[PDB]
């Protein structure tokens, strides 16, 4: 929606002023404004806007004042602040060149390993936003605790992902569906799906831990498909982002399923060519994925997962609106 997107984007400049406008150190506050302006407001803002929409479908229609919708928007920007911090750090860790076409922050002149500090700074900053706007509301402490908990869980996700690599070479014996599912849950699903919905619920004064647990069950399932679809399109999606999962030696759903279905000779091709810099090595792995019928396998998974998740949504108890979870399903599966 034009009105929702514009109202949301209009909040960002206020959050920069809140965090940067410490009058004795103007040179660092000016630099932090640039850190925020480069890394936080560019691209889709899907997680941020999903927080606003989640709130709009959870709150009683009589309580949906512009004031409250703005508070939802500020929570959305706190999600985008958390993500910005995570992606600054991940880019340094993965030594990536670009993110969404933009050169990675750490590559910019006179940053490098100072990106570590900028990561921590950006993550810490969202708690200052929460204090200014929410310190007087009952949802304050639950929201602070949710952000700190999700940060901790995301770090477990990132560390689990790193235990699939040694000396910058993939450990293919680690590429199991159980480890993949755990990586997606902790590294992606909590901050991408649980965080926006739980923020919406808290702002709507929904504190029942069972309601949050029932939301989690369905959101972790949708989250798994989301990342599996993302992994699939990296290799088989119409380029005209250019996919580099194979070169980077990522524990992707494609690599996991490839190893499940491979005969010994096919396993040897993964051992020899997976996570190598040569473009020839990327094409050999892609050719193996085609040979193992991974496009057909994804097509079956997409149809089956959709049906299973839709069934689980129909069985949701409590005051949780099924509407919200069907709406999330629609945007992800695009149907």
Binding-site positions for Mn(2+): 90, 94, 161, 230, 234
Closest to Mg ion by CB, 189 or 214: 189
Q: How distant is the alpha carbon of residue 81 from its chain centre?
A: 12
Q: Is 291 helix (H, G, I), strand (E, B) or coil?
A: helix
158 binds ligand GPP (CB under 6 A): yes
By CB under 5 A, tell whether 236 contacts Mg ion.
Answer: no
Shorter beta-carbon distance to its own copies: residue 156 or 316? 156
What are 102's strand-pairing partners? 99
Interface segment toward ligand GPP; rule CB under 6 A; list 67-75, 88-96, 134-142, 286-294: 88-96
For 174, residues 6+ apart whose C-beta sits below 8 A from its C-beta are 163, 164, 251
The span of 58-66, 152-160, 210-218, 304-312 binding ligand GPP (CB under 6 A) equals: 152-160
Task: Count residues binding ligand GPP (CB under 6 A).
Answer: 13
Q: In a 10 Å sphere around its CB, with 0-12 CB exposed, 13-18 middle and 19+ buried, how is residue 204 labelled?
A: buried
CB-based contact 211:201 (threshold 8 Å)? yes
Longest Cα pair distance anywhere in the chain, in angstroms?
66
Query: Which ranges in the chain belong to alpha helices (H)?
Result: 2-9, 12-20, 26-39, 46-58, 66-94, 115-134, 140-162, 177-184, 195-203, 209-236, 245-248, 253-261, 264-273, 279-291, 294-314, 322-333
90 binds Mg ion (CB under 5 A): yes
d(CA 175, CA 257): 9
Tell me the binding residues: 90, 94, 161, 230, 234, 245
List 103's β-bridge partners, or say none.
98
Within 188-217, which residues bind ligand GPP (CB under 6 A)? 188
Site mask for its own copies (CB under 8 A), range 94-133, x = bound: ----------------x--xxxxxxxxx-xxx-xx--x--
Applying CB under 5 A, which residues contact Mg ion?
Answer: 90, 94, 230, 234
Applying CB under 8 A, which residues contact its own copies?
Answer: 22, 24-25, 27-29, 31-32, 85, 89, 92-93, 110, 113-121, 123-125, 127-128, 131, 135, 140-141, 144-145, 148-149, 151-153, 155-156, 158-160, 162-163, 165-167, 182, 185-186
């Amino acid at each position: 929606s034009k009105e929702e997107s514009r109202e949301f984007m209009a909040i960002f400049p206020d959050i920069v002023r809140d965090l940067t406008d410490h009058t004795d150190i103007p040179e660092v506050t000016k630099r932090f404004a640039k850190v925020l302006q480069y890394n936080v407001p560019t691209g889709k803002k899907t997680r941020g806007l999903s927080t606003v929409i989640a709130y709009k479908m959870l709150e009683k229609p009589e309580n949906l004042t512009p004031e409250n919708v703005r508070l939802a928007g500020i929570l959305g920007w706190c999600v985008e602040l958390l993500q910005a911090s995570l992606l600054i750090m991940d880019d340094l860790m993965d030594r990536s060149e670009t993110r969404r076409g933009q050169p990675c922050w750490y590559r910019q002149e006179n940053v490098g390993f100072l990106a570590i500090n900028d990561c921590l700074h950006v993550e810490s900053s969202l708690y200052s936003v929460l204090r200014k706007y929410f310190s007087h509301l009952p949802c304050y402490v639950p929201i602070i605790e949710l952000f700190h908990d999700v940060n901790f869980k995301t770090n477990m996700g990132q560390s689990l992902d790193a235990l699939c690599m040694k000396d910058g070479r993939p450990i293919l014996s680690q590429f199991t569906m159980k480890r993949y599912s755990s990586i997606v849950k902790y590294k992606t699903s909590y901050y991408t799906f649980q965080l926006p919905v739980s923020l919406g619920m808290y702002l709507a004064d929904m504190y029942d831990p069972e309601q949050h647990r029932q939301a989690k069950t369905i959101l972790m399932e949708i989250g798994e498909f989301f990342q599996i679809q993302d992994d699939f399109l990296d290799a088989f999606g119409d380029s005209q982002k250019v996919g580099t999962d194979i070169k980077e030696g990522k524990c992707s759903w494609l690599a996991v399923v490839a190893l499940q279905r491979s005969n010994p000779a096919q396993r040897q091709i993964m051992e020899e060519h997976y996570g190598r810099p040569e473009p020839e090595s990327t094409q050999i792995i892609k050719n193996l994925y085609i040979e193992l019928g991974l496009p057909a396998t994804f097509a079956v998974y997409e149809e089956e997962s959709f049906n299973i998740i839709r069934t689980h949504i129909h069985q949701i108890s409590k005051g949780l609106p099924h509407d919200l979870f069907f709406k999330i399903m629609k945007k992800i599966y695009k149907r």
